[PDB]
A paper describes a structure:
Interestingly, from the late 1970s through to the early 1990s (strains Bgk/79 to Shn/93), a marked decreased in binding to N-linked and biantennary O-glycans containing only one or two LacNAc repeats beneath the terminal sialoside is evident. Co-complex structures of H3s from the 1990s onwards reveal an interesting pattern of redistribution of H-bonds around the terminal sialic acid moiety. The alteration in receptor binding conformation shown in Figures 5C – G is principally contributed by HA variation in the 130- and 220-loops making new H-bonds with galactose and sialic acid. Residues 190 and 193 no longer make H-bonds around the O9 of sialic acid and the second GlcNAc, adapting instead to make new interactions along the sugar chain and giving rise to a slight structural shift in the overall positioning of the 190-helix.
Previously, we and others have demonstrated that over time, IAV HAs within the human H3 subtype have evolved more complex receptor specificity, selecting for elongated α2–6 sialoglycans featuring at least three linear LacNAc (galactose linked β1–4 to N-acetylglucosamine, Galβ1–4GlcNAc) repeats beneath the terminal species-defining sialoside moiety.
Numbering used by the authors:
A (entry chain A), C (entry chain A), E (entry chain A): 9 to 325
B (entry chain B), D (entry chain B), F (entry chain B): 1 to 173
């Protein structure tokens, strides 16, 4: 007689269905998930420098809203802005808010360098009960509210050379008084005009007297503008009234920094990839947690599962 | 599927084979047994581990991008912001779907190929001493005890030792 | 002797050429076209709510140009704007026209809610022979042209709270008179100023007296502005003249709605995919009709044909 | 091409085979005939129908996008609107071209594989009773009438019935 | 006995490593590089019409800065702007500079058509020592600086119909004087206003008197604006002072033209693909030289090498 | 790899084979020699030249795009300009990486297939006159001089001339 020798392959009782070019569902012995679909629900504080905005937006921290004073000169890899944040200073708006937030976020620092502007002829350090710092009526820490001195406000013509080797970010504003009385009680003339120039550019603003909706005790507003002065260029400031002056500049950087909207708590852990839902592992090539990410992240896709076969076809006995 | 070994001429798999992916079952004058083949098993595992590593390479460190959620209605600029990202996610979703479809197709075909290569390797050794019954088994036309089965599994089978016995058994009346 | 058994495969006399990785053209027995390259040439009215703009742009229907009155409060999935459309009211321009058109189109409704503004002290319902409604000189149906009353125009300060739970879209304007005489004959002061505010934002406009090119009897213009007021916020309107006031708000939605430029006729048929060329089938994964689509559409590609082999290599006898 | 059966060792196809994709032609003591093989034909058709369904899945319901035609020259914002869409269409055009190139390559290879699997299936049954002439035909070394051909086509051929007759015919002088 | 016949394949001693789905590095007998990673370092003057900007930006050539006079009416497929370029005329800024540069670059021509504007009542051809043309104080060649005539500047109301079949590009400006004295010494009234209208649109500008930083002898500026007038429409110009008038229009085209920033020299050679690094071959499907290209170019990728196997697995003896 | 011929049952390649990709080495009563096989060599080269041409087709004439370098910080619009291009380059980088990975996988598999097809073609001719030793060689069981080797290489080998001699040699004791 003799013998019989059979050749064969293994099988498992608990196979998994995968997709191919030909077949939406064919059973294989083993597979691995390629789509990340969970988060811890917390943002890990390592390895990125996470700065929790707390009650402060980035813009409120930049201007120096008093409850944001603790953010002065701070740095971040990722600024986390919280949805409970509140402004609590003079009512303001920022034309092209989104761009200012973006370029400050990208610089990754609120490092502020005080400069000695020559404001002889006007008073300084104006304040408001809408922007309390301790008990004293106050104002944005990084801004200098100029008003009249002995009942005159002379045409200011103030310059500042950039003799350094880096770009300077200047934040300044324009006051829109509620009434003509307040316009003249502050600035004498019935309408002012703020012009900020460099060798390459010019931004001129006119106040619009009139009541806006009531906000934190005030029907009046400030508008926030910004000007970047390159090395060798110069800032020149011209205003016949209503100028909300800079106190100096923010050092503008560029780096790997950004900003994210999230309510996830910051935790003592390490993860390269951050989403608004929390940090996620990046062992898989794709993820379904959020299209918003920061760091070394799996790429966002619509699928909630993609299984890669890691074994042969399963053919049960 | 592409070679017709797995899910084809080999009726089905062996659930009791839990020391390897491919292997041998025999019946002879001393009984029956089962042994895994380590090289073909490792050859398939190495290829699969290879494809897993290539998918786990990219860093995709991205830091400052665009905003992707908006609380205000804005018109033109936001339509473009939304459209660019939607465009991006749909293209990656295609890449991911296709990649998996290609990888999975290739994995089944390549695991089928290891099965066939082991069959052909075993066939070639047996020379004129065995016939393929067509169901993934060889009829061996001589006495072939456990040491003999071991020599086939080990690749040390000497067909010349058995050829006279086997040929006489094959070509009977 | 015995017998011969041959194994073989079929062939056809009329094969088709397809592309592979290796070969730009190899013959197979059968193939199917994967690129849609035709349209019926008509837009099917099902299953989407198609609103034919006819002689009206969306913006003319929003403002309420008299020949567009029939579009009041209407809704759409797809607004189809026709190239023969004409404005026939007071000459106007809309700064960032494209954005207003987009956000109204996306809301998918012109549903308008009248509100009782307190305009005591000015006259209402100004009109022009350039905007005839029937025989009477008239104006945009959704806008209220305020002018002087007994030869005075007092500073208006008018508010409107959003006590609802939805966003309100307000459309308003600024009149630019042709001459100083008309400026003063309407508004008394030689130059007015329109300020529209919310708690978060402010848009202030100044008229520019002077002649524009002659259009429908007028050298003068109106400029269209818009303001969205969120729930709990408030619209406050301040103007010393030249205000083209809202009559109320449009309810802003978001949904699956859009707008399309097309001259294709609307027909009694069903197709998920609409293009400016007409509706197209979506059985194929790709299409070459138009990059502009709406609905469940094949994806637009540059190729005009892509053939998927559906049979084996063809090897003729 | 990848298996050398179609467009290779099998000279060419059969235009008169219009009841199947694969099949049998024979010559024996009762004449000649032709019969389709249903399983290999269906196996190929099922795979092809599979790939057609996967391409006909995506919905791609898109509603409010960006404008794509412009009647005014505008500069920066329109350059970006135009560039994003151009970027999108070129990437999809690549995906479409590659998808078809991959699918078509796989279709020819997979239809070739069904051809080879039927040859090997038929070979294995015939055991020592036939030889491969190398042109896609077997020489059958015994009398094998129409019922006999039917048994090969049906998979019920009993090689042991004919082996003595066939071996005596194969190994002559 | 008999014979032995062995079947085999070739091998080479110097194989090359390539990537597959399975293996990052497997050795094959031969391969070809698919990523272009070098440039000649020069931009070939064929087959595209290359216009070397030299010391001139495109915008300086458009306005007609005197050292750019040689660029009048010239054409290009690719305008190459050099980093050493300098403005040397009246200090100016262009709001949305980037868009004007883009649309002029895309038109591919500076072809300028002089028109006879009716400027009776004001003087013409104002100039400045900051914009010397030869020895004479001068100005942008394509612009007409209007100032007072016998100590009056009457309200200008000037029109120009487009009776042609093509679009007209009009470039004009607004003068911002340094001082009130210069404002009145030029324009009489203390503040002017420039309005440029078509049937569809209106751009009105107000000068902002005041000193900007010192540039080429001047603390004053000009702002550049542009207006496109379609066939059958009309340009109407209204200004009470400070108008920097057009001398006519640029014919606007559309074609395959663009602009590129590069310091690469132009050479006597032929290459379809141009990058800022220089021209590159386009025989490979991908390139790593620069994401900025013009012409028939390999597609830009991050990889610096991608090798396509052109032979079998290499299995050394 | 997918067929186990190259980098598999054929121990290794021949560095002295510099007139072709595939070929023959023999040992017989007149000595030894080496000859390239032109058709299988050309068949592989034609397929590879085919894939090279498909990659060298696209024009991608692009003229006026968006700016991609910026000397000023601008915020929102530039973030979108930067993001769109970054999105574009990453998708093409994936396409390029995958294309090469797919092409290279297919090239090794397809060159392996030409190797196997030549082995099977040669096997089929030899019929019962040779046996496969499993290392890529045939033992030919009859006197087979250089003209005889030439007939196998040329495809003109007449197995019937040698079958009696070969069968008598194969089936000894
Ligand atoms: C143009 O028209 C607008 C709107 O009509 C006017 O704006 C209003 O101005 C008045 C006068 O200052 C404002 O009155 C103040 O309102 C504050 C906010 O009220 C909140 O609480 C009430 C509760 O009933 C809510 O209904 C309301 O919506 C708010 O949520 C009050 O807190 C103020 O009172 C406090 O301060 C004053 C001193 O400042 C004290 O005397 C009080 O005792 C109390 O401590 C005050 O009553 C009103 O809120 C404004 N409304 C809006 C919508 O802005 C403009 O003034 C008008 N312009 C001109 C030039 O006339
Ligand atoms: C600044 O400069 C501009 C342009 O020079 C002036 O604008 C012109 O103003 C006049 C005065 O109103 C306008 O005259 C009117 O033109 C209408 C349009 O004419 C059409 O038909 C003619 C046919 O010859 C075409 O050539 C032309 O292009 C138009 O297509 C006429 O229809 C008017 O006549 C009708 O109305 C009047 C009453 O309104 C009746 O008396 C007539 O009988 C008839 O029914 C009228 O003649 C002229 O069209 C304006 N042109 C432009 C380009 O705007 C500004 O007025 C000027 N500003 C100042 C302050 O002076
Ligand atoms: C508001 O405030 C600003 C800044 O404080 C004033 O702007 C200055 O105005 C003065 C007066 O015209 C300018 O003085 C001129 O400066 C030119 C540039 O100087 C260069 O070289 C010096 C070398 O020390 C550098 O330090 C400097 O940074 C520059 O690089 C000089 O070249 C001028 O002199 C030449 O021209 C004059 C005639 O025009 C001749 O008499 C000289 O001999 C020489 O040929 C001249 O001195 C000054 O440059 C301005 N600075 C800035 C930053 O703008 C505004 O004037 C002021 N506004 C009002 C209304 O007061
Ligand atoms: C709305 O704002 C305007 C400013 O544009 C205010 O205008 C003043 O109105 C008062 C009368 O109430 C006049 O005496 C002033 O001369 C106006 N000033 C200017 C600069 O024009 C107006 O007061 C505000 N509305 C209300 C109701 O107060
Ligand atoms: C991560 O967060 C996002 C958004 O915060 C989640 O997406 C939401 O999913 C719900 C349904 O579960 C929808 O109603 C919302 O509209 C989605 N949000 C958006 C912005 O589309 C997502 O599910 C979260 N993922 C995890 C794992 O928690
Ligand atoms: C199914 O396959 C997975 C992945 O191929 C295997 O688990 C891996 O095991 C390797 C070692 O072989 C380890 O490096 C990892 O811990 C595992 N990786 C992943 C992604 O899971 C294993 O062969 C199978 N797993 C199970 C649970 O059956
Ligand atoms: C162009 O528009 C201006 C407005 O900026 C008009 O200016 C008026 O001109 C007349 C003389 O024609 C003066 O009496 C007025 O005092 C000016 N008004 C203002 C507010 O400045 C000018 O009239 C228009 N052009 C023409 C030709 O009429
Ligand atoms: C669908 O419409 C588009 C545009 O309306 C057509 O594309 C045009 O094709 C012609 C040549 O046949 C070109 O001259 C035009 O420039 C194209 N238009 C655009 C905007 O590029 C397209 O051919 C139409 N398709 C069908 C099937 O009718
Ligand atoms: C060529 O192939 C097509 C598509 O593979 C076949 O026609 C299909 O037939 C199926 C049933 O087998 C039906 O569901 C459809 O009506 C057809 N679909 C398409 C996309 O055509 C058929 O095998 C061949 N057609 C022809 C005309 O030869
Ligand atoms: C800054 O620019 C303003 C213009 O907004 C200049 O204002 C003039 O100032 C002088 C006094 O220096 C007054 O006599 C004029 O009446 C003002 N003109 C206007 C139109 O308001 C101001 O002079 C400039 N600054 C300096 C320091 O000169
Ligand atoms: C082509 O030019 C670009 C930019 O001019 C070069 O990219 C630079 O590479 C250096 C390192 O070698 C970096 O420090 C720069 O930051 C890069 N520039 C940018 C804009 O990213 C590129 O290397 C050049 N290629 C060749 C072949 O010369
Ligand atoms: C390696 O392969 C390359 C490309 O496959 C070959 O060189 C090509 O030779 C063809 C003719 O066979 C010519 O058209 C070209 O000049 C070459 N093209 C390229 C892209 O190099 C050749 O087979 C091998 N080259 C070397 C140097 O070994
Ligand atoms: C099958 O069951 C085992 C035992 O629990 C488990 O480890 C394995 O992951 C399962 N495999 C699949 C594919 O479910
Ligand atoms: C934020 O404000 C609220 C109320 O004062 C409080 O929960 C919390 O103390 C504040 N956060 C910080 C960081 O002070
Ligand atoms: C085969 O090899 C294994 C391990 O290398 C060994 O345990 C076994 O004894 C061997 N059997 C024979 C018959 O050589
Ligand atoms: C071949 O002709 C038949 C008969 O008209 C037709 O149905 C079929 O579609 C044709 N096939 C090809 C590939 O042209
Ligand atoms: C559009 O206007 C023209 C001319 O009045 C006419 O063809 C048609 O009746 C109008 N359309 C509608 C819907 O009234
Ligand atoms: C083979 O099967 C077919 C259909 O199942 C049947 O018609 C035929 O008679 C069978 N022939 C033999 C020889 O069994
Ligand atoms: C191997 O060396 C030859 C001889 O110089 C050369 O032509 C060939 O390109 C080299 N091949 C590889 C893959 O390095
Ligand atoms: C550019 O200016 C510099 C200095 O005048 C000089 O190198 C060169 O001659 C100028 N270029 C041209 C084209 O005149
Ligand atoms: C085989 O063919 C080659 C070339 O076609 C020829 O040189 C050689 O003589 C032939 N040999 C035989 C044995 O036919």
């Amino acid at each position: 007689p003799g013998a019989t020798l059979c050749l064969g392959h293994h099988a498992v009782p608990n196979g998994t269905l995968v997709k191919t070019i030909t077949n939406d569902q064919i059973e294989v012995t083993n597979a691995t998930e390629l789509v990340q679909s969970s988060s811890t629900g917390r943002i890990c504080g390592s390895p990125h420098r996470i700065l929790d905005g707390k009650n402060c937006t980035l813009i409120d921290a930049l201007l120096g809203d008093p409850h944001c004073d603790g953010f002065q000169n701070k740095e971040w890899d990722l600024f986390v802005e919280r949805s409970k944040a509140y402004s609590n200073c003079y009512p303001y708006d920022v034309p092209d808010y989104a761009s200012l937030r973006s370029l400050v976020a990208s610089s990754g620092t609120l490092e502020f360098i005080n400069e000695d502007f020559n404001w002889t002829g006007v008073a300084q350090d104006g304040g408001s009960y809408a922007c309390k710092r301790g008990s004293v009526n106050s104002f944005f820490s990084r801004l200098n509210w100029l008003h009249k001195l002995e009942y005159k406000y002379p045409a200011l013509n103030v310059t500042m050379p950039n003799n350094g080797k880096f770009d300077k970010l200047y934040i300044w504003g324009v006051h829109h008084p509620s009434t003509d009385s307040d316009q003249t009680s502050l600035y004498v003339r019935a309408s002012g005009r703020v012009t900020v120039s460099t060798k390459r550019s010019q931004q001129t603003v006119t106040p619009n007297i009139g009541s806006r909706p009531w906000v934190r005790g005030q029907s009046s507003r400030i508008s926030i503008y910004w000007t970047i002065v390159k090395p060798g260029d110069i800032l020149l400031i011209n205003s016949t009234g209503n100028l909300i002056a800079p106190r100096g500049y923010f050092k503008i950087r560029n780096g790997k920094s950004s900003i994210m909207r999230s309510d996830a708590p910051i935790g003592n852990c390490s993860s390269e990839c951050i989403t608004p839902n929390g940090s996620i592992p990046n062992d898989k090539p794709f993820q379904n947690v959020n299209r918003i990410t920061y760091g070394a992240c799996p790429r966002y896709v619509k699928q909630n599962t993609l299984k890669l076969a890691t074994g042969m076809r399963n053919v049960p006995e | 599927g592409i070679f017709g070994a797995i899910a084809g001429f080999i009726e089905n798999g062996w659930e009791g084979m839990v020391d390897g992916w491919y292997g041998f079952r025999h019946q002879n004058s001393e009984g029956t047994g089962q042994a895994a083949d380590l090289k073909s098993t490792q050859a398939a595992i190495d290829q699969i581990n290879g494809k897993l590593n290539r998918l786990i390479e990219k860093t995709n460190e991205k830091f400052q991008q665009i905003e992707k959620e908006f609380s205000e209605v804005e018109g033109r600029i936001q339509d473009l912001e939304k459209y660019v990202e939607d465009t991006k996610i749909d293209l990656w979703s295609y890449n991911a779907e296709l990649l998996v479809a290609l990888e999975n197709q290739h994995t089944i075909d390549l695991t089928d190929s290891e099965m066939n290569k082991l069959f052909e390797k075993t066939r070639k050794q047996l020379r004129e001493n065995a016939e393929d019954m067509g169901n993934g088994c060889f009829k061996i036309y001589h006495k072939c005890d456990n040491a003999c089965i071991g020599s086939i599994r080990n690749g040390t089978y000497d067909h010349d030792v058995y050829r006279d016995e086997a040929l006489n058994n094959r070509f009977q009346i």
